[PDB]
Amino acid sequence: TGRPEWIWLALGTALMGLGTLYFLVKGMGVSDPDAKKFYAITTLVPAIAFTMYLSMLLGYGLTMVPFGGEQNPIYWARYADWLFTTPLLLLNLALLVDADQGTILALVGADGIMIGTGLVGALTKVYSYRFVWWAISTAAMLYILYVLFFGFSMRPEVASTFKVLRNVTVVLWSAYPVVWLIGSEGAGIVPLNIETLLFMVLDVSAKVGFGLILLRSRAIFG
Ligand SMILES: CC(C)CCCCCCCCCCCCC(C)CCCCCCCC(C)C
Ligand SMILES: CC(C)CCCCCCCCCCCCC(C)CCCCCCCC(C)C
Ligand SMILES: *C/C=C(C)/C=C/C=C(C)/C=C/C1=C(C)CCCC1(C)C
Numbered sequence: 001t002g003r004p005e006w007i008w009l010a011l012g013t014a015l016m017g018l019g020t021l022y023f024l025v026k027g028m029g030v031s032d033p034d035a036k037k038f039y040a041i042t043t044l045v046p047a048i049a050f051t052m053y054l055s056m057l058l059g060y061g062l063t064m065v066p067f068g069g070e071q072n073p074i075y076w077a078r079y080a081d082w083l084f085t086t087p088l089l090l091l092n093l094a095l096l097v098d099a100d101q102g103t104i105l106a107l108v109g110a111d112g113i114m115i116g117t118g119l120v121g122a123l124t125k126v127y128s129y130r131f132v133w134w135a136i137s138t139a140a141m142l143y144i145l146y147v148l149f150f151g152f153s154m155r156p157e158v159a160s161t162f163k164v165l166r167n168v169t170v171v172l173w174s175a176y177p178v179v180w181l182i183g184s185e186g187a188g189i190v191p192l193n194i195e196t197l198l199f200m201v202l203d204v205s206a207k208v209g210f211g212l213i214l215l216r217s218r219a220i221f222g
Contacts, residue, residue, distance in 0.1 A: 005192055005195075008193065008196045009200070012200040013053040016050035016203075019212075027042075034220065035221050038092060042215055048084050052078065062076070067126070068127050074184075079116075079118060082115045087111045089210065090144065091108070092214060093165060093166060103151055103152070107147055110144050120133050141176075145173070148170065149166070157218055158219045176199070179198045
């Protein structure tokens with residue numbers, strides 16, 4: 001289409017759809033209750049992202065936000081996606097290490113704050129305050145990363161996959177605040193189409209690459 005980032009939204013739609021169908025097919029037959037949860041979470045995540053990617057691709061998940069005296073294209077549909085998929089991703093981690101309920105509530109809650117303040121920052125029309133919201137959201141993110149590293153005798157398989165995915169998590173999730181800051185939601189240093197490319201590469205890796213690593217490990221089986 002006529003938005004140059006369409007190709008990345010189309011590619012992301014395709015890859016999230018394909019990942020969803022792959023994991024769907026893959027978890028066919030699975031009968032281990034514990035495995036079941038990881039497959040459910042793991043399939044649901046790019047399923048949701050598939051729909052929100054599609055929503056962006058078709059223009060529904062896009063709005064215009066006036067700031068800097070300009071009419072700025074903001075893909076709000078990403079926060080609808082992340083609002084659900086990032087806690088689910090954190091749930092995969094939390095389940096893996098058998099986290100306490102209170103740690104799960106702290107993560108999910110921190111995560112909703114992260115995304116909702118990100119969303120608020122995304123939609124805020126006073127340019128400076130956009131970054132106040134960025135900052136609070138980043139602080140929730142840093143809280144989450146804190147908890148993933150310092151907040152948790154588990155099976156060596158679980159520990160191993162958990163350390164890998166945790167690593168994967170810290171490196172990819174940390175990139176999102178940077179992209180937002182330098183891209184069109186923030187300082188407008190990086191153009192929207194490049195930003196969408198970046199978020200697509202992060203999202204696919206954070207969702208599909210992450211679940212391919214998780215769904216590969218025997219850590220998911222009781
Ligand atoms: C009781 C304790 C822990 C601290 C009180 C001492 C006073 C110092 C200020 C707070 C410092 C503690 C956190 C250290 C790490 C940081 C990254 C602090 C960043 C400071 C800047 C803005 C964030 C808000 C703050 C007012 C803490
Ligand atoms: C059979 C397997 C392993 C995967 C098929 C599921 C579908 C999803 C798409 C491929 C995902 C797997 C790799 C995860 C990591 C990444 C960094 C993917 C980046 C995607 C974007 C462009 C690169 C080309 C791709 C089409 C894989
Ligand atoms: C499914 C995709 C994932 C894992 C997306 C993760 C997104 C984040 C970690 C977002 C973080 C942000 C902040 C820390 C700063 C403000 C803006 C955000 C929402 C991009």
